[PDB]
Design a protein around this nucleic acid. Structure first.
Length: 257
DNA sequence: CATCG
DNA sequence: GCTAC
DNA sequence: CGATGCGTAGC
């Protein structure tokens, strides 16, 4: 029995102030994947590195209060890879991977290109560099969960206002196409959609207007899983009882040992 | 990027 | 206040 | 539709 949680915390410190540290243990989660630390190794409390005695591995940005991802695990990773082998992005702490034997979990924070132009460009280049290793990972012939903030809504059902957002970063045709390829041409399972084909399952809501109240959201947080493990999926839900961030934790349970 | 006009 | 969101 | 504005965490 295996439970994986993926959460963009929007400031690890903010989240800890909002009750996330307790959630890490109450959830029963065996592995937690976090994005948007907004912190560097120095700013990290010991409780934000080894929560409840879990192991932990992180990759922080070369800028204070920016990006970074981590994975915490009740078990000790017999291997770990920080950064994705190309510095241009590794400078932004955007990719951590952990291998527990046959299993590999990775925390990913794909670049948001909504703020401005060059950001969109970088996002595209990131997709370019990433696709090949998504493929290689697929080919590894093992159980791999790539979870995190993919910053791309796949289809109309994946966001309330699909109509007016077709010209905004996050729902452009190219992005949806990329996702499509990684799911179909590459064979990665979008675990949530595959588990509940009709439920939207938003994971994010803009701070604008009353988006969070009117449930005007996006499903931009994924758990992309390999076929064999995917099939072993049994449950999933978006935890929404407490709010630790402008994202919500996405929890998936697999029958696996 | 929800919302207005 | 400023930045990236 | 296309044009207005705009909350947050952390420097």
């Amino acid at each position: 029995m295996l439970k994986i949680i993926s959460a963009n915390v929007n400031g690890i410190r903010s989240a800890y102030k909002k009750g996330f540290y307790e959630y890490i243990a109450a959830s029963g989660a065996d592995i937690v994947c976090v994005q948007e630390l907004k912190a560097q190794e120095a700013d990290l409390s010991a409780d934000m590195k080894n929560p409840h005695g879990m192991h932990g591995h992180w990759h922080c940005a070369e800028k204070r209060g920016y990006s970074g991802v981590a994975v915490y695990s009740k078990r000790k990773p017999d291997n770990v890879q920080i950064g994705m082998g190309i510095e241009e992005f590794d400078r932004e702490g955007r990719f951590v991977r952990c291998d527990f034997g046959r299993l590999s979990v990775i925390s990913l924070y794909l670049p948001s290109g909504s703020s401005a132009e060059e950001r969109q460009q970088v996002k595209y280049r990131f997709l370019d560099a990433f696709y090949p290793m998504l493929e290689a990972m697929k080919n590894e012939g093992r159980d791999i969960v790539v979870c995190g903030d993919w910053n791309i809504a796949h289809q109309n059902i994946d966001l309330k206002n699909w109509k007016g957002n077709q010209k905004n970063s996050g729902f452009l045709p190219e992005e949806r196409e990329w996702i499509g390829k990684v799911i179909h041409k590459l064979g990665w399972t979008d675990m949530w959609r595959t588990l509940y084909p009709d439920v939207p399952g938003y994971t994010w809501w803009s701070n604008r207007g009353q988006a969070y109240a009117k449930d005007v959201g996006w499903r931009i947080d994924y758990q992309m899983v390999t076929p064999e493990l995917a099939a072993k999926a049994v449950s999933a839900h978006v935890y929404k009882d407490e709010k630790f961030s402008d994202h919500a934790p996405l929890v998936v349970e697999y029958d696996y040992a």
